[PDB]
Amino acid sequence: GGGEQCCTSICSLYQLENYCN
Amino acid sequence: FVNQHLCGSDLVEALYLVCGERGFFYTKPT
């Protein structure tokens, strides 16, 4: 799809929390 | 959580469910 980060790899709700705020 | 693989729309769905009210931000999707 383009610049992905949690697709081919695997992050957690934390890395997802780094996108908020 | 358990195993999960988001790639764009599904990634924002996890960003809209993780932030909730704290806020939320993102550039361009897939």
From Swiss-Prot, chain B:
This is Insulin B chain. The gene is INS. It comes from the Eukaryota.
